[PDB]
Design a binder for this molecule. Structure first.
Ligand code: HEM
Length: 112
């Protein structure tokens, strides 16, 4: 179990994606000799779905207080590599209905 960081990218562009701000305190655990990312998804209510290379991420916990906050989890093959990720952002009051495909690499926060 390690302090981890997730870097998101605006699809093909290598400029940092906005979604990065909606994911905080990423943590990397290793089970069965396999790499598992457990991350906090802030403002969860605006996420109709969140898929990773596609299957939805699994939600360990759900909070409903401040526009939702779901502790999400998924698996990664290798650390340093880019991975395709899809999301549906749905904000009824706005109303913001858009689906996005970005790329994300998950790393170790600090040096080992
Ligand atoms: C949970 C809330 C939201 C998330 C996770 C989110 C995420 C994203 C993503 C992944 C993209 C495409 C890739 C990128 O920009 O890096 C994007 C683009 C964009 N975002 Fe959002 N967004 C959210 C809410 C909003 C809001 C509230 C606004 C404006 C008030 C907004 C305005 C835009 C616009 C105009 C684009 C580009 C549209 C296009 O090029 O077709 N988004 N956002």
């Amino acid at each position: 179990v390690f302090d981890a960081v997730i870097k998101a990218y605006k699809d093909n562009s290598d400029e940092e994606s906005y979604a990065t701000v909606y994911i905080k305190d990423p943590k990397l655990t290793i089970e069965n000799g396999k790499r598992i990312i457990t991350a906090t998804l802030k403002d969860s209510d605006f996420f109709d779905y969140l898929k990773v290379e596609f299957h939805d991420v699994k939600v360990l916990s759900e909070d409903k207080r401040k526009h939702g906050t779901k502790v999400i989890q998924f698996e990664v093959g290798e650390l340093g590599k880019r991975y395709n990720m899809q999301m549906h952002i749905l904000i009824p009051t706005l109303g913001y209905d858009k689906e996005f495909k970005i790329q994300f690499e998950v790393n170790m926060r600090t040096f080992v």
